[PDB]
Amino acid sequence: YAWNRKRISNCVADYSVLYNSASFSTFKCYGVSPTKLNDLCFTNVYADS
Amino acid sequence: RLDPPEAEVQIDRLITGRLQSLQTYVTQQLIRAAEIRASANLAATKMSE
């Protein structure tokens, strides 16, 4: 209910390592195929934990 | 952005829309061709007479 929010910017993201990290029980993507993430440039991202 | 099978859905949507629009345009072109051809036949008759 009090879900935290975080903003990240001004860096480069290596999604390959995170994807290869099998510790994630669920690794799902809606607007993107999990593989392609390592080849796009983005305005910014929001992470909620 | 996406993986081929998922992309195919959007591909289908957009091709349906585009083909429908362009065939409609072609139909309008056909009608305009018919009317202009009638006009041209009348003009040729007027010329010759």
Annotate A12-41 with DSSP letters as a single string: ---HHHHHH-TT-S----SSS-TTGGGG--
Contacts of A3 (CB under 8 A, 6+ apart): A48, A49
Best A19, A29, A30, A33 residue to mutate vs chain B (most B CBs within 10 Å): A33
A14 within 8 A of A38, measured Cβ to Cβ? yes
Q: How many CB pairs under 8 A join A and B?
A: 12
Write the CA distances from B38 to A40, B32, B33, B35, B44, integer angstroms. Answer: 56, 10, 9, 5, 10
- Chain B interface residues facing chain A, Cβ-Cβ under 8 Å? 1-3, 6
Instruction: State whether B2 and A35 contact (CB < 8 Å).
Output: no
Residue in chain A nearest B6 by alpha carbon:
A33
Resolution at which this structure was determined, Å: 4.2
Contacts of A35 (CB under 8 A, 6+ apart): A19, B3
Q: How far apart are CA A18 and CA A12, in angstroms?
A: 13
Element holding B39 (H helix, E strand): helix B4-48
Q: How far apart are CA A7 and CA A49, in angstroms?
A: 12
Task: Name every chain A residue with its beta carbon within 8 A of the beta carbon of B9.
Answer: none
Tokens of B12: 């289908």
Task: Name every chain A residue with its beta carbon within 8 A of the beta carbon of B6.
Answer: 33
Going by C-alpha positions, the residue among A48, A45, A20, A18 that lies closest to residue A31 is A45
